[PDB]
Amino acid sequence: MSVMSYNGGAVMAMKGKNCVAIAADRRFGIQAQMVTTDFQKIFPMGDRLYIGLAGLATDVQTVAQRLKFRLNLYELKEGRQIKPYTLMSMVANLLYEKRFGPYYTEPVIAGLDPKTFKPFICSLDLIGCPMVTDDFVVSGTCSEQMYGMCESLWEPNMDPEHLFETISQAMLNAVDRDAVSGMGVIVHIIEKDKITTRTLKARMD
């Protein structure tokens, strides 16, 4: 899921965890180079309608390869009446980037999602075309990876409800936009229940 460059006018993903919900927060940023004109266009996409995968950088191949991957995820989702596992999709994405051989164009995938029908928490980032990345901790990713990583450690509420994570996250996104050109350009925060997706769109330039 290789995208041309990184210049997409914003590149940032943060994922942060609870035991009652898990959240993936994203720039909703679009429009390559410094000049934007828009602040809307899909980037995080529901693929089982309750798991997300985020593909990050320039708009065209980000949307294009996601959709072409969606079709292979779908095949597997379609046939059986139960939908695919997160761990098997996690290597699937790793391989998809790898197919684009040596001296490849850099994407940065972030997968956030609770596992389907074996219930445990999952957060992962891919980048380059790299070794397997299953973690159960926290993951922040992009080219300003260090800046995201800080925030992904920052939100975990192990015992508060879903709501407190959102309000904490709104401040977390904002402070990050003042620190880098990767956050911002409108922010979409996704709190993911297992049975559906809740999309909230945050106020913030």
Next chain:
Amino acid sequence: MSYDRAITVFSPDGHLFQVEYAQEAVKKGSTAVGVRGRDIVVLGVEKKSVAKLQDERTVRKICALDDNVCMAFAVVASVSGLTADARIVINRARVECQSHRLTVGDPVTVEYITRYIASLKQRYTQSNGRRPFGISALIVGFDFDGTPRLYQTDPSGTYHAWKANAIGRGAKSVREFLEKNYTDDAIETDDLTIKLVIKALLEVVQSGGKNIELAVMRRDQPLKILSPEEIEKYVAEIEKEKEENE
């Protein structure tokens, strides 16, 4: 993919088998008439068997290859020839039509597109594992000086310029009758060109003014496909005018 042994081979009969089967298959068909105007160049087919449970969309015999070029195909036969067969000749010409249109700065020369059409149906006859289509097409368009044309091909690819030509129901039968119909004072306005197309189609149509499908095309504006309800209004006017004549 293609068949290792040839479908079309030179055998003794004078032509070829598949040409021979192919002339039969547009003879036994229904009427498709094309009249050449001085406004719009208009094509129409006798049959689609419309009855109000279905709607035409791409179901039309008349399909526009280009912004000013369109062709109406009569694959149509004893038991009905194949929309499947026509569509291939259509796909290949349409890409070529648009490439020429790009190149000429005025409306695309019909001439190129018809010559082209003729070679497409012939190349299958020489190609291994293939056979020619059993269609006859009315290639219509306007030139790069704006000269309206109505051309015809048969199944093996042979082409002529015509004032008006009609195919199917015995091709020779109907086309000699379209000369009689045709007037040059009856092509002077847009409704009069359309009335000449329709009069040949009425002859033996089952449940007319619904089955009758004809589309109009403008100078470089896209094809306007007319619905049969709208076409019916003209059909009534002529069908009474025709009764009056006898």
Next chain:
Amino acid sequence: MAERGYSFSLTTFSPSGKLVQIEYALAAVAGGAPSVGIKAANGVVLATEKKQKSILYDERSVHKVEPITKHIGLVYSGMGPDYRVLVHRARKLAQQYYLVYQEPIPTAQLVQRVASVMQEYTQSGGVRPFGVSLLICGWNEGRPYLFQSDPSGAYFAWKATAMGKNYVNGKTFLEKRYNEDLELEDAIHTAILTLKESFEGQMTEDNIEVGICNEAGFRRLTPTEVRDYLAAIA
């Protein structure tokens, strides 16, 4: 290859509404040795009887139950030669899916992919339509799967189905004894009953093979275990 080759189809329809060669192929699967496949809904068991009739087979390897990969297994019906390509094919597919997913090929997905290649073989020339019926088992994504793949290309998902010798009797017993969402013990027991329905392939332990798919993967069972299940049926 070094020739012209074929490309013409060996099947032409009928004004009946049938394809002629697949109906001859269906007769060959029935002429096989009994192979049953049941998805219990607590694991998948595929059991077969193999006509060796001399037990001069030193197989600690290839059998009529052969694992495709570590949580897919395959059992056939009919003739052996057609099996040989399908078993190799399946292993290759298992490998293709292993590279990207790295969880070996899922059953719903496998069938579609085999089905497409089987259909070509009918549709094209220089190849011919099989006359083997495969029963595919898998446990992946915390669900057991049982499918049957016909020699045409068709795939149906079954709870319990039979093939091989005296399948008509088998499918009818299967409806009566087995009902949907019964236990792993019932699935195994009826499975061995269908083989016993009519045997006649030398009654020794190494003449029946079972391979079971469950939560921990797929392994084929030792012939001695298989015999114990049989012993119950009179």
Next chain:
Amino acid sequence: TTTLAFKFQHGVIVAADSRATAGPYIASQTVKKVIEINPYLLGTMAGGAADCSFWERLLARQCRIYELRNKERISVAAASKLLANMVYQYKGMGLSMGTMICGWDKRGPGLYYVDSEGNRISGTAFSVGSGSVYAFGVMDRGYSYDLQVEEAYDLARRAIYQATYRDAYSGGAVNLYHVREDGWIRVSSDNVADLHDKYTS
């Protein structure tokens, strides 16, 4: 509106102008250089800029006009011939191509004159030039520019422009080539010697 290829159309008829000279700096090897290629009377073309790239695209174009004409029997559109050649030019880059040709031929609406580049420009104007020296040529022509200029004013306008050009940017030499397309079928006026033009202006 640049180099030794220029064409502008007027109200009496049309003028075509070219040099026949080659070799910037002391280096030279071609003294009867045919920048206005025209083996036939039906289509005419011009060069400009890079020596190799003009010659190559125009010999490919040479074949291309002849083929259209053959296929229709009568001569086709000036636009179609030129545009089929333009698709090839854009794709042609990666050979150090940098072709800047002016396509002239007879179209059905009338005379058609179109501007060709190696990056695929196609626009119809009354006047086009390819290269870098007609940047100098636009000051004396523009000043006096009418589009109803006499046949006689135009011949004198071209003759003088080369003589004045020689003085201003050196490069002219051997022969001055003049061609006139009159009606719709072209003729080459004269291959008038350099030494004559110097005195006249």
Next chain:
Amino acid sequence: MEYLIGIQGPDYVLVASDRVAASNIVQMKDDHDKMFKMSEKILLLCVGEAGDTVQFAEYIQKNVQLYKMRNGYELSPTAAANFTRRNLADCLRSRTPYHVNLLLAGYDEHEGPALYYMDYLAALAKAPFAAHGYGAFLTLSILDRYYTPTISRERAVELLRKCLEELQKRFILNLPTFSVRVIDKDGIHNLENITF
């Protein structure tokens, strides 16, 4: 490249756009008696600006595509569809010897929603918006285009807004220019608005 201007401000249904007349190759304006605002259909316009030469190349490629899709639909184009398809086609063609590296402007009349204007970069990033600018001019124009409407435009204020910008482009930015085409397209007919 790094020449040539576009600006579009969309109204209640109107859209006003202007671009300069001037195709300069080398150092001098080769063509100027042609416009390079193209009718790809009679409901759709592409106005391409960047490379003077590169505009025709992109226009033609889209022209076949737009029609092939029209065939597919067998009814007029959809705005959403036109931005994404032209974007995909153009990012792939940028690498190609037949390149694109133009900031293009889609104007279309949509069968359902209504007026649509679609933003395209040189890098080639698709966005529908209602306040956007094109060419070398896009860096210059876009903040201003952000400010002066509330949601979308009103034509009177726009007219004043447009004349003010056109003195600026000649002033600060460097074109060969001496005439500008100003147009409003309501979605079915082309209107000429006046040049400053």
Next chain:
Amino acid sequence: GVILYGPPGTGKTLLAKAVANQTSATFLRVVGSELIQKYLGDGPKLVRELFRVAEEHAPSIVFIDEIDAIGTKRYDSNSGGEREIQRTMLELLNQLDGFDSRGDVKVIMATNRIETLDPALIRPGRIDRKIEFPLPDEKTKKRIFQIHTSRMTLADDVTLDDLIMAKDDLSGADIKAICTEAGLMALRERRMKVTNEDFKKSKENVLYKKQEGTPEGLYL
């Protein structure tokens, strides 16, 4: 002679019988499939007899019904075998002209198509003229029906036009089939009346069996 081919059902059989009365030629009818039979060597002998008898009778027409049959089928149910089919096929050719060159014996051949007919049999210059019937139109159909209406029970409940219109450009046979099925249908009811209701029911069965319009409507 003549060769009668095209769309089957035009009324190919009626035509031989009708023309035969006008000329007043002795009408011999023999099926082409009847000539191949179990018996060994009886097959060509029979064909000789068929011609010999036609000749003796004097003006004659031999209507050979369903001759298409020898060609289409390699029967595999005759003990005479493939041998039988071969030897029969030659003898008819011999008896026709051959070196025999019998005169006054016209053969009118009824076939489905003469593209399904055996290539030995078919050849020009034994039969000078071949007639290909067009698809019967709405117009031809009315005249045939007025005759059948005259032969049928008379009422105002006979509605001819409606049935003809509904149908497509299709055979003469159908006009006959609509009338015969309508009388039969009446008997089921316990009615000796043939009304518009029997006809409307008859239109459906006749139309399906013969060619059926709902496949064709898509392709048109």
Next chain:
Amino acid sequence: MSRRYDSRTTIFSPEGRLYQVEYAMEAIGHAGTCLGILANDGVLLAAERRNIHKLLDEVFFSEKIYKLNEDMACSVAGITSDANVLTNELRLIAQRYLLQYQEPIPCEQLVTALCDIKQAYTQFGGKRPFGVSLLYIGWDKHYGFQLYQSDPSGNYGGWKATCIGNNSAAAVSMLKQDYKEGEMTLKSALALAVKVLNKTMDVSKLSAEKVEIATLTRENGKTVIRVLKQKEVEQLIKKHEEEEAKAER
């Protein structure tokens, strides 16, 4: 190969329609009824599932109805082996068009692309056509709501209410009277759909397993494709029997 094993599998007939295609229609007839009916706010497919036996794991959503895309669906009537090759490709083309274009896939577009592959087999290759006629239900932003049929040859016709399977001829005839081209809401449309399955299927009591109705409706500004539940299908059947008793006496 050999030329004595060739009488030309692929050839043109003088009647214009291939032998193998008419032969394939009889096979379509044999498989169970699959219909599509239009609503003025949706489109739905109603089909009888190939399975009718007790034994079925129910790994597919329905063997006949394939959920291809988030705006397109198709059902198959005919040869199931043949169905698997067309439905998998179909799944990929319909999906690419909604996904990328952001413009919902037209049935008319879809069919022309698939029919090219079907057709190639009938004209050349020595091959044979597909055994299925497929009914596409979808919504596109162009025409609006649509229904398309494709046939073995690669011939299409666009209806708005059509039935295929056994007693097709009877069915379409019933459908002409009650539905023309748009008059039924989503609930009446669904009632009409159950009615057609009723006459044509032998069992007139039906079941949620026996039939499957999947609906496609755009609700709350996104186009929703859903397989209805066994409860929902059963509620529609229970509502339909009461009404069946009253309608025909």
Next chain:
Amino acid sequence: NQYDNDVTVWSPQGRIHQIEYAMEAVKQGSATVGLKSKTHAVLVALKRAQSELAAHQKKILHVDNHIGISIAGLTADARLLCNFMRQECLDSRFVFDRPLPVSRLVSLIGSKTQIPTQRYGRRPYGVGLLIAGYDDMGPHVFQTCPSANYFDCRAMSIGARSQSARTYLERHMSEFMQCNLDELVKHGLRALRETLPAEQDLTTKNVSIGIVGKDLEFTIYDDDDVSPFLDGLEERPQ
């Protein structure tokens, strides 16, 4: 029978009947004499026209200016072999930069002729070529047939009525070899006139000569210098 129904199906004759049909195509074709010296190789061919109001045209087709062919059979089929031959001469010039060895050149043709003979029912090329070539070994006049087998002949005559031409080659078998180039063309026209009856005799219009050799390129004389050679009759008494 049923063993010539294809050329894959073998005959219980030891040679397929279809190979032998192809040999009749060449016999039905034009009388041609091919002789060589020890510097030059000469092809004498008989022209034919397909109409009365037509001037006869060469049955010598150029492979090239160093190897050349004379057709006996179909003109089209000879040309089809020719094109391949032309390519080889075009490659010979690239690789070796000499006239391609004639024996080598003939085996590559033979390989091509071999191929339809292998295929199902496909046609073996029904031309025989008399190939005149000049290499470093000397001149070669080869006989190529409708099979893949080539003969290296001293002099051979193939085509119609060629036995009368063949007794001439036998009589002056040693003579061709020692002679000067003008004489080599002279014995060929004397031999070629022998095929024809006493009545029918060679004239400048129907005579085509192809001369290749050490000293000169392949040149076709159709009326270029046919005349001094044509001079002196000596026909077979029939």
Next chain:
Amino acid sequence: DRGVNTFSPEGRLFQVEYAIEGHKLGSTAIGIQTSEGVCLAVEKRITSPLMEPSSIEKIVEIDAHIGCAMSGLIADAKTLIDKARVETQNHWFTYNETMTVESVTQAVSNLALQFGEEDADPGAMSRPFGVALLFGGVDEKGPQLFHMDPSGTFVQCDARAIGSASEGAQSSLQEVYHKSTTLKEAIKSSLIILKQVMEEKLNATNIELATVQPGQNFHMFTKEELEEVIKDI
């Protein structure tokens, strides 16, 4: 069964034998070469004059100094001539001389027969052409007319006619034409034979005339000049 790719018991190819008879169904080509130009006359092959003669093509320019008139199976001919136009032009393009009538003729003759349902692919034939061509043009040596037939035989011609009766078309030629004769008689000598070989009438919409002459390209006759020549019988 066996092919049409097999030899007959005559020792000749089956498919080539059939092709010549196929020619006879259609159009005629009459080319008369005089030393003042090469003229081509061909029939439009009409059903009515109400068939526009605006752009019926059957005499087409191969090069602008060589024209070609076609006879035989008209459909098969349309692709052979289109193809012939590119190959002659590749030659014109490289050599930059005025093409010779004999070079165009040889080149198209190998394409006639490549037939076979083995050792051929879609771009190659699976049937022989049954198109006989008459290429007529003026070169450096002067006016030449060449006849090409499906068996690839190329021959020099001063008058060659092939048509609906190939035999018929020729027998009339002997009778009318004589070796040294004017251009104006050459055009006329074609109109008298043209009728003989056709079974159809003399109409201006039914004949097509083209002359290629020294210093002068391929010319297509208009309705007025088509009439001047019809007058000359």
